[PDB]
Each structure stands twice: as structure tokens, then as C-alpha cells.
Design a binder for this molecule. Structure first.
Ligand SMILES: Nc1nc2c(ncn2[C@@H]2O[C@H](COP(=O)(O)OP(=O)(O)CP(=O)(O)O)[C@@H](O)[C@H]2O)c(=O)[nH]1
Ligand SMILES: Nc1nc2c(ncn2[C@@H]2O[C@H](COP(=O)(O)OP(=O)(O)CP(=O)(O)O)[C@@H](O)[C@H]2O)c(=O)[nH]1
Ligand SMILES: CC(C)(CO)[C@@H](O)C(=O)NCCC(=O)O
Ligand SMILES: CC(C)(CO)[C@@H](O)C(=O)NCCC(=O)O
Lengths: 307, 307
């Protein structure tokens, strides 16, 4: 059976590093690593460095493609100080590590030789505000496709990829659990834009951000593991994020281990798990690279799209 | 508002021919032209020749892409007598002209300088046989996604694009209105494969043939026009195809104009129109090039994806 995909173990994948230099310190890694994440410099070298080599091979190759369409159209030569931005999507469940994966990726690419402008945007900022979610009866479906302003999202990425000087995204506050009035993240003709969220790989009856991705990753793990990671993070957060009296979820800080486990499981069951099974997982087949994690968070398997 | 798309009129589009030679005679065109189609050598020159220039620019460019992934993987050099097959999808309603568009495209590309092997496959052969459609209660939904063996279809195109020496498709008989026992269409590592059908541009919870297309066309027209074309073709066929006593639809040959119009409208209303509105039209946003036809079948407008 021929296949669009090729499967690697960590042994096979890490050979593909060739001579890519490691440009990240252990301390720098910490600044990027999320609560509960196990990524170390060795995963960076054995997993993220071949990745970064793949990507940089494909950035130049993907530029030929837009150049052919320019040539056809009898369009001028593209300013080499403004190529067409390479767009990278990163997807997966809540709690699977995908935001760290994306932050690490950004760090690695920014440190490539010619110092590319590499911006990172999460879909959080494109959530409808709570007052608007409440209007729509969606206050308990944050993360589902319909809880996002997908039109604004598509506009944002279309703007950036189509060469705009600047494009703006709104900004979400996890502390306050809402969009921040007046806050903008401004992206200015970067060379690479990484877009990370749950359903960014979705497809449908209109052109969507996934149709603009030049490359995508999906961070995968067994569902039962993800839940464990999610519950455990929730318990840990009683003394980090929920401890802040300003935090929308401050009431959780004083939950017993057992009360906390019960609350987190209920949130997993009613929100995150269904969103995962119904919307996120069905996008996995399309990702250029699936990063498969074991129960201990360690990436030991990879699936690349060769077609 | 920035846009993934650029819109042309025939004036703007035909300028993009540059010096592409016309290699098709009027007689050759006839061999390709479907009952009721108005395509002439002038549409070929003003519409299909820029198209063919776009495509050939993108074939070489799209090869860089697969080469980068080979390089990354430390794969050998690709035999230049066997590149990775460029896959082209052609979609649209029944009766809109898309099969002629595809046959013409094949003729034009086969006549490019180095004489590329250019195969053409329609999704007809991947319809479930009638006995199997009946089992599924689908004898009146031929053309809807579920009336096709989509797994076999995906396998076929995956086989070809992944470099197989040969791949086989079953063969449908319009005369008999069923799959022909024992018949195979054999495709042998072509340089380009054109795949044409109603829903070939569809997307979903699994990797599908649209995810393998390097380029796609959608042949568009106003729904009311398509219906007129469909009814008129049905009336014309009383003296061509339905006239054959072997034809599954021979009974239609003896319909009055008015009986025929009533039968065709009913088939349009209950089968083709719903399939168009529900399944085919929602794929239009993704096509690389939409060919928009006026009431007289003439292509006067085009929409290209630049992103
Ligand atoms: N305080 C806070 N920050 C969050 C939360 N969710 C995501 N973040 C932001 O994203 C980072 C998480 O890194 P990582 O563990 O890779 O995130 P993830 O696996 O995508 C977890 P989730 O998808 O649940 O956010 C956090 O360090 C923080 O910057 C949250 O619930 N609370
Ligand atoms: N005899 C016959 N041939 C058909 C039929 N439908 C498609 N074909 C094949 O496809 C060709 C049609 O050319 P074209 O007019 O572009 O097809 P189309 O617009 O896709 C029409 P449809 O989609 O309804 O087949 C025919 O000449 C024939 O080879 C049909 O109902 N009867
Ligand atoms: C469970 C964690 C810590 C992991 O992301 C986080 O999703 C969380 O608990 N956030 C606040 C609770 C909530 O998700 O509503
Ligand atoms: C209406 C035409 C002639 C146009 O394709 C053709 O679709 C047709 O009439 N075929 C046989 C009738 C049927 O579609 O069942």
C-alpha cells in the first residue's frame, strides 16, 4: 500500500539533523517551556533541529512557487527584502504541549543565519469576547470552532500573507479569561508567521487559514495521556495562575486535590475532550508533520507528509 | 480588503498567452468537444493557452518542492525520466462543460515541447456498481459523494502520485449506465494526471484526492444556465445516445419535446441541482482557477488563487 505519509522513530528522525547548529541555551529553553512540559535540549536537538532543516529547505522551494505565478502574471520582481511570508500552522489539543512546540519553533527559526523576522500568533486573540459568547450561548464552548471570529482570523492571515505592511490581532487575557479592550498584537511583514491554535487546521465551505499554510504541525498524544496532563496542570495551577487574586479562576486555588481532580475532569469531559474528538483530531490527517508524544511528554515518533 | 484571489476578464487573461503556440486544429477540437459545447479555437487561444502557460511554469516550480523534501530526507536524486506526477483536478456541475475543458487541457499539455505523458481519468469509473448502489439505496443519488468508492479513488491517485509503475481504475459505461465488468483503465507513471469529476475538490475528515492536487480548475456558470444546458442536452440526446436500442435510457428517445423537458427538469431538481448546491459549489473557493461561463457557454471571466 502506497502512502502519502512516512513514519519515523526518534532514531531515524534525528539523523536528519545533519549539521544544523544548536542556538538555544538551557535557560532560554526555560523561558519557552510551559508548566508540566518536559522538553529538554536533547529533544530540541533530536527533534526540533531536523524540523528546522526541513522548514528552511521548504521556505526557498515554496518561494519558487509564488515566483512562477508572478512570472506568469508578468508581475515585477519581488523585493528580496519582502518575500511572500511563509505561514506555519500548529495544532492539537489543549494541554498537549503545542504552544511550547510553537514557541520553540519560533526561537529556532529566528536564529537562522540571516535573522528572519519570525512572528508567533495564537488564535486566542480571535475568540469572541465573553459578552459576545454569552449572547451566542457559547460561554461553555470556548475552543470550539464557533467560539472564534474565524472571519477576522482569515482576514488577518490573508492580510499578512498577501504582503501587507502591518496587520493587527486582538489579544486575549488568560488571567481575566477575556479579550483585553484596546489591546493589539501588530505583525509587520514578517518572513515567517506561526499560527497556533486548536482548530487552525480545519477545512470547510470557505477559504480558511489552513488553506494558507505552507507547513503545519500537529502535536499528538493518546487521549488518556492528554487528559492526565490536563488534570495535573490544573492541580499545579492552584499555586501558580489561580493563586493570583485577580485571576478569573481564583476560586479554584482553594480546592482540595480531590475537588480539583473532579472539576478538571468535568471540564475535560464536557468541553476539551469533545472538542478534541469532534473537531481537532479530524484535522490530523492533513498536517505536514505529526509529533507523537508518549505518556511522559517525550516525542518518540513522527509522521511526515511526503504527498 | 486583501484577497487570496485575482479576477480577470477575457481581455486581461488572454494577454497572458505570450508566445504559447497553438498546436490544435479545428478538427482535433471537434474530437474533444461535447454535445452542446461552444468552445472554438479562439477560446482555446484566449483562455486555454494562458492556462497552459501557468501550468507549465508551476510544474517545474512544484518539482522543486518535492526535491527539497527528498534533499531533507537524504534521498537519492530523482530519475529525470520519472519525476513526481503533477496532479490536476477539474470540477463542476453535470452539464457545465468540465469534461470538455479537461479533454482540451489534456490535448494542450500533451503537445508541450518534450511530449509529456498526460493521462486523463474521470471519477465515473469509481462509482459503485448499480447492484451495490441499490444495496445502499443510492440508485437515485449517482454523483453524490457517497455514490463513489472514494477509498479506491484515493488509493488510485495516491498510487500514481507516489510513483507507482502502473495503477488501475475501473471503467463506467454511460451506454449501460453501470460499471463494466472486467474493464480497466491503466495509468503508467505519467508526467501529468488530470482527474475530473463533480466532487473531486471535496475535503473532509481524511486525506482525500483534493489534498493531492497540485492545481485545480472549477468550471462555473449560473445555476439557471446550467439547468438550461442540461435540459437542452437531454432533448438533443434523444437522437444521439438514447437512440441506441442498447442504451439504458432508450425509452427517452420517444419522448415529446414537452415530456423530455419535464423528465430532465425532474432529474435536475431531484438529483443534479441538490448535488450542485450541497456538495460541488461549496468546493469552488479552493480551486486554483475558476472558469466562469456566460449563458452562451463562453468563458468571459476567471478567478485565480494567488494564495
Ligand atoms: N495562565 C495560563 N496560560 C496559558 C493557559 N493556556 C495556555 N497558556 C499559555 O500557553 C503556554 C502553555 O505552553 P504549552 O504547555 O505548550 O501549552 P498547551 O499544551 O497548548 C496547553 P493549552 O493548550 O491548554 O494552553 C503557557 O505557558 C501560557 O503562556 C492557561 O490556562 N493559563
Ligand atoms: N453518452 C454520454 N456521454 C457522457 C455523458 N455524460 C458525460 N459524458 C462524456 O463526457 C463528455 C461531455 O463533455 P462535456 O460537455 O464537457 O461534459 P460535462 O459538462 O461534464 C456534461 P456531464 O457532466 O453531464 O457529463 C461526453 O462527450 C461524453 O464523452 C452522458 O450522459 N452520456
Ligand atoms: C488545565 C490547564 C491548567 C491546562 O491548560 C488549563 O487549561 C486550565 O486549567 N485552565 C483554567 C481552567 C479552564 O480551562 O477553564
Ligand atoms: C442531460 C444530459 C444529456 C447532460 O449531461 C445527461 O446528463 C443525460 O441526460 N443523461 C441521461 C439522463 C440522466 O442523467 O439520467
Amino acid at each position: 500500500e502506497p502512502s502519502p505519509y512516512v513514519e519515523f522513530d526518534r532514531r531515524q528522525w534525528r539523523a536528519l539533523r545533519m549539521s544544523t547548529p544548536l542556538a538555544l541555551t538551557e535557560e532560554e529553553l526555560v523561558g519557552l517551556r510551559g508548566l508540566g512540559e518536559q522538553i529538554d535540549l536533547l529533544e530540541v536537538e533530536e527533534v526540533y533541529l531536523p524540523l528546522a532543516r526541513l522548514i528552511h529547505l521548504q521556505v526557498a522551494a515554496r518561494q519558487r512557487l509564488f515566483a512562477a505565478t508572478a512570472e506568469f502574471l508578468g508581475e515585477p520582481q519581488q523585493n528580496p527584502d519582502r518575500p511572500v511570508p511563509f505561514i506555519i500552522g500548529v495544532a492539537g489539543s489543549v494541554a498537549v504541549g503545542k504552544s511550547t512546540t510553537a514557541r520553540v519553533l519560533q526561537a529556532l527559526l529566528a536564529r537562522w543565519d540571516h535573522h528572519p523576522r519570525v512572528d508567533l500568533v495564537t488564535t486566542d486573540g480571535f475568540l469572541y469576547p465573553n459578552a459576545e459568547l454569552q449572547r451566542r450561548n457559547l460561554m461553555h464552548r470556548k475552543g470550539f470552532p464557533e467560539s472564534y471570529n474565524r472571519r477576522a482570523l482569515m482576514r488577518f492571515v490573508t492580510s499578512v500573507k498577501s504582503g501587507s505592511d502591518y496587520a493587527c490581532a486582538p489579544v486575549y487575557s488568560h488571567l481575566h479569561y477575556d479579550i483585553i479592550p484596546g489591546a493589539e498584537q501588530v505583525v509587520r511583514h514578517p518572513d515567517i508567521l506561526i499560527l497556533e491554535g486548536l482548530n487552525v487546521l480545519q477545512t470547510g465551505p470557505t477559504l480558511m487559514v489552513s488553506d494558507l499554510f505552507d507547513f503545519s504541525l500537529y502535536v499528538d498524544a493518546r487521549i488518556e495521556d492528554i487528559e492526565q496532563w490536563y488534570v495535573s496542570r490544573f492541580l499545579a495551577m492552584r499555586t501558580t495562575a489561580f493563586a493570583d487574586p485577580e485571576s478569573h479562576f481564583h476560586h479554584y486555588a482553594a480546592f482540595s486535590d480531590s475537588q480539583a481532580v473532579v472539576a478538571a475532569r468535568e471540564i475535560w469531559r464536557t468541553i476539551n475532550r469533545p472538542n478534541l474528538v469532534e473537531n481537532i483530531l479530524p484535522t490530523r490527517p492533513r498536517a505536514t508533520l505529526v509529533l507523537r508524544k508518549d505518556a511522559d511528554h517525550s516525542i518518540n515518533r513522527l509522521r511526515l507528509r511526503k504527498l
